[PDB]
Design a protein around this nucleic acid. Sequence first.
DNA 1: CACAGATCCCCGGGTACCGAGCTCGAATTC
DNA 2: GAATTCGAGCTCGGTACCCGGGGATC
Lengths: 1087, 268
Amino acid sequence: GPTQRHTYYSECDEFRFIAPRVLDEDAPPEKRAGVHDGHLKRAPKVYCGGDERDVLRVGSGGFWPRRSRLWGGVDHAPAGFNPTVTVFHVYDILENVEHAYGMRAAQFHARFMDAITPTGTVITLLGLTPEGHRVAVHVYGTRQYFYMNKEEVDRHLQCRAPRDLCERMAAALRESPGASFRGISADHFEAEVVERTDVYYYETRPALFYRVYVRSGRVLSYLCDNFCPAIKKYEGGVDATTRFILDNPGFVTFGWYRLKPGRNNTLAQPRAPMAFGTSSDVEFNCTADNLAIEGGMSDLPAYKLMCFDIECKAGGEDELAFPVAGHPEDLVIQISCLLYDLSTTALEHVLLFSLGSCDLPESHLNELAARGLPTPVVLEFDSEFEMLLAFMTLVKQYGPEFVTGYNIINFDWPFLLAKLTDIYKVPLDGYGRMNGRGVFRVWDIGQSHFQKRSKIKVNGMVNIDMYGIITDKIKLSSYKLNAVAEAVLKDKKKDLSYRDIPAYYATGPAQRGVIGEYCIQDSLLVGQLFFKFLPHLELSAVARLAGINITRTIYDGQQIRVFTCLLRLADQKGFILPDTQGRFRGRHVGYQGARVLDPTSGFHVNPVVVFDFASLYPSIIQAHNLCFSTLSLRADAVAHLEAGKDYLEIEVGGRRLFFVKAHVRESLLSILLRDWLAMRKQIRSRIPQSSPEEAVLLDKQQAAIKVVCNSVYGFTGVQHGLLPCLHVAATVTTIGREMLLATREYVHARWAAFEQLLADFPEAADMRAPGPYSMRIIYGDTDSIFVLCRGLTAAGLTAMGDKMASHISRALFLPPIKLECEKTFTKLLLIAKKKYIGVIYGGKMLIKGVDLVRKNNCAFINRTSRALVDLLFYDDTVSGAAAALAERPAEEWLARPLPEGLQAFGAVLVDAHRRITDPERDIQDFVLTAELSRHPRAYTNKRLAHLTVYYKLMARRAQVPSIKDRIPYVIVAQTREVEETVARLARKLLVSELAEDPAYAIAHGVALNTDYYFSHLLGAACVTFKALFGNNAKITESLLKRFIPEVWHPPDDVAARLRAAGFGAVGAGATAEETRRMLHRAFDTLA
Amino acid sequence: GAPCQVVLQGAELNGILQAFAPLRTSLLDSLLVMGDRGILIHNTIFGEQVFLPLEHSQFSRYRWRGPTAAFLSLVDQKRSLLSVFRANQYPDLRRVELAITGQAPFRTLVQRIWTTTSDGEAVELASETLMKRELTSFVVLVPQGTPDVQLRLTRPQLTKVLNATGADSATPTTFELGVNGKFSVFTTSTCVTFAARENAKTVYGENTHRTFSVVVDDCSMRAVLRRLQVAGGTLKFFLTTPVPSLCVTATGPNAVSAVFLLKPQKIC
DNA sequence: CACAGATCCCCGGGTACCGAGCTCGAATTC
DNA sequence: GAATTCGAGCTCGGTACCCGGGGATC
Ligand SMILES: Cc1cn([C@H]2C[C@H](O)[C@@H](COP(=O)(O)OP(=O)(O)OP(=O)(O)O)O2)c(=O)[nH]c1=O
Ligand SMILES: [Mg+2]
Ligand SMILES: [Mg+2]
Ligand SMILES: [Mg+2]
Ligand SMILES: [Mg+2]
Ligand SMILES: [Mg+2]
């Protein structure tokens, strides 16, 4: 059949029939619990409505769409299919070894067979044509390589010719511990003598290296980790894709391309439908010279997006437990699968896989037809295997280029793949885009102790989980899809909790249809989120600019972007990037960060101009020409250069460091940063000319590019990371600290009196407000300075602050550096170092790290804290009282009555006290959160509330959170039962032992800890408003609790016997006259 | 001056500091029910109700306008409005004023301090003045009426009767008074007795014919009345209630009293 | 296998005092 | 014989640090 074998199920005649027993409707009520199980012998079928078909039968008809040409060797295209391909968008790039013995019958030309002769690496470009045909171009050529110093290799293994070195590298692989390099010869390792320079230092001279062309780059991973581990290999971590992108100038990992005539006239050689490696329509065999970038096209092809969502049932003794993939009875029941078009954003198909009958409710069908959405194609199955096989068959046949969903990397794909590999033993290596031997794998953090994220790598399929896209574009306490839907989409959805799915599924098809409706609506919400944020476009802009494919952009982190950009620059300039990490693996820091000036804490009702540097550390790297290639630790490399004119000299970490200037050697990091700073500036140049809803999204996109810009700095200062230089990173921060202080001293020296301010800026003449002028920095941070401008009006203070900032940046700093007046607060509450609130001029409130902007707290405390700060800032007669509080030292307020304005500031607190005890207290207002952030075994302090509740959830078999989830929890009241239970699982209990989770605490009506929640309400108030009271949290706490209404009762078991002993009560439980008359009765009784 | 006003200049204040002399820290986490007829200082120690009346005549000036007010003594939860009247907290103190200023649901009370100087003047230690807010909801259960029969005692007498009383719930005690002077405070393995006159076991009292035998189940009396360091005083019995109660009022500088609840098992 | 940086506030939990109480135990000492 | 006291010790929690950890702010 095919030359290469297709490792996906094209046919099946026997499988493992698992299915719930309640699906067999006419069978007695006592054969209903549990599931069936066990082998069955029939091709898997799918019932779409009244019809029925084999799952794996492509044929003509079909219950789901198909974009596949081949299916298990048969060619299902109309004869005469031969689309011409001249331009093809490329979205993913694979690489995969290809053996010239394996492609004997494939009938390539010579010039590819000889490019794989024992073996080659083939760079597969996946993509679409403008007419929608799925291309796969195979780029022969393109073999990886590294460098080793010529003299170093010549010495450590006596070498006279390069061939003798190819021989020795082969010799070393043939002796490897386990026989992975069988037959390896002296011709798999061609080498030449190149004349490159290491990139770490200015003094380094261009040596002679050997450039060693490996094929089959896993041999390079061996020949890089095990070959002569005392010689230094330079670029042995650079995979073949990066060699393809970089070696060919112009090429991109995401963009339109074009086939060319080629080197002599050699052409693209269209493969024969049997020799297809991928699931594509047309396939080609090029080399890098038959390809052209085809700039001028921008638009995105017709690519498809699948947006799936599984629903699972637990089928064990406890059907309220949460499903588990390993258990054969905790089975998937439904798979919603929406099929959008990525270019037009148009939902095309709405598929619902359903184990058993599913009749979707009419109301839902009519809401779909009302909104114009396709009609749901409900596909029914008997067994879970057939349902999952049909889902994977859709994924293979349709072949969505992009997949998404919500939490599809931590629950949906792991659940499904655990089923398909543990239980049903299906090889997923062919269910990607390659017909076999492709990666279809998930990774999760799994106590790895650095891993930032759980990844997923299907080949030729870009999985964008919207959970991770939204956690880094919106600050929410809870990232459940309902909370995210409300907060982003303004869509109050109804969630079905997994505890209510067994009760529904057991009933007829109409409730199973209700489950299917909640499944579809989840996926419709996720499609809306995807097309609001459009993550593929921003991430492809980054992938295009970095040089990495889009999946490495989504998953691999910020360092490989910088490493690839730097690698492009280095290879142009004639440099090479050593490997150090190849030999490599408490709040500790690597070097000294930035300066945070001491705030003059307090409520400042005068204007506070906030200057700050634009792109500070990138501008330092560019201004001062910081790099690896410009650093000199030793004052000899610059012994023939003028000081101050040809090189900077700075004491960093007590080490004198010489950074030669441009016009001697341009930094490599400067040029890298140019490219990324231009990208960020282009995104920002559309914020003023966009919608409000679009300026918010654009703000987040320029913030992402800002992170990639600051990661160039960060990449120098990562210890045991790729290509680090803490001399450059420590120099960046050293110049940053110098500039913060230089700016403060300039402002303090020049503009100390109003005459000098007026001499610089005559437009200050119309800005003198009546008090006595002064201009003092009252706070600063890495780049900002807060200049408290007394005696100046806030009206035109930013318009002159721009001119001040240009004045300072001209007088002090080098050209790429630029200080700029970014705000003006008409009121500021400098709480602490990284904490402050303030109303920007004539405008918005800026809250910076004061726990109203922190995801810890409960909405109750946040709501009341916001109410208080709104009183302080907006409500006049409380800003007057608050500004009056500074005329006394804090302790005088402990004696004196607080100014008569601040009473409303305690009315809020008093109201909140009322509101906290009131017995409706919907406990969603009282739900704290915390991020797990590492395996619960990697903690040392295992006495945290979210860990407590994590283990309570795993104890009850509920849904255990994931490593970066947020773990919501309530603080339940300490009760003799809770006490006994905690000691059972093992006074006054800790808040880590009163740590229930809200679902439990509603189901079991566990009551909240009013003491805790109010003490923390007052704690948040105290943390903010200690700035009014001389930053004394103690005094503030005392003065805030003086608001609260104090209450005293003789307790029950005391009040009882007192009412029994003929004492009448006087106070609450009687009318005021009745209390007075009884008080008369007492006073005359005692007298 | 400000509407409700309680001033203790010297020479009547020396009596009030003397009243607080023995008590130590006891009445600091207390409740101060001020109003007409004076101030009542109530606290709970060990589960019993201890009172310390301070009459309106018993201040250099006592003046009240409005309904009675009730303050927790712990200002901001450490300090105390009575800590001024302690044994040696402020050595050189002479005077205190308690000025109240507000409207009936919301009064606040301020306490200023005055220390002696040379040449007849006073420095106001404004670092240690106190400000409290009226409770804004409260109710206390004060004792009422007058006892059945009350007997005055001394330090050695009262010390030994407190020695006679129990240790824990095992052994309930009983202040029976027999006919013609058989006052007795016993338990099973200790018993003490006095004569009741209307030498060394001849207590004085009034209405001595009113025999009974009260019974207590809770033996916190010894701890309670030892903390307050009572110097012997009145022992008052209250039995015309379903729950009899015994009150104890030192005749030393203070009138600090303590009511103890005698369980309903009343018999003669 | 995986991988930008640092600074810094505040909370929770832990542990180490120690000034202040404050209750008996043999010394004074009525 | 017997009201002091204050050493004797002893549990008392406020206060002080310290540390991890969440999660802010450059
Ligand atoms: C926000 C942020 C800042 N920084 C460092 C680098 C910055 O140069 C320095 C100052 O921070 P920012 O003011 O936040 O960033 P910036 O000034 O560089 O960029 P912009 O023009 O938008 O203001 O802090 C990081 O390293 N990472 C970050 O994620
Ligand atoms: Mg789901
Ligand atoms: Mg999901
Ligand atoms: Mg900045
Ligand atoms: Mg700026
Ligand atoms: Mg800034």
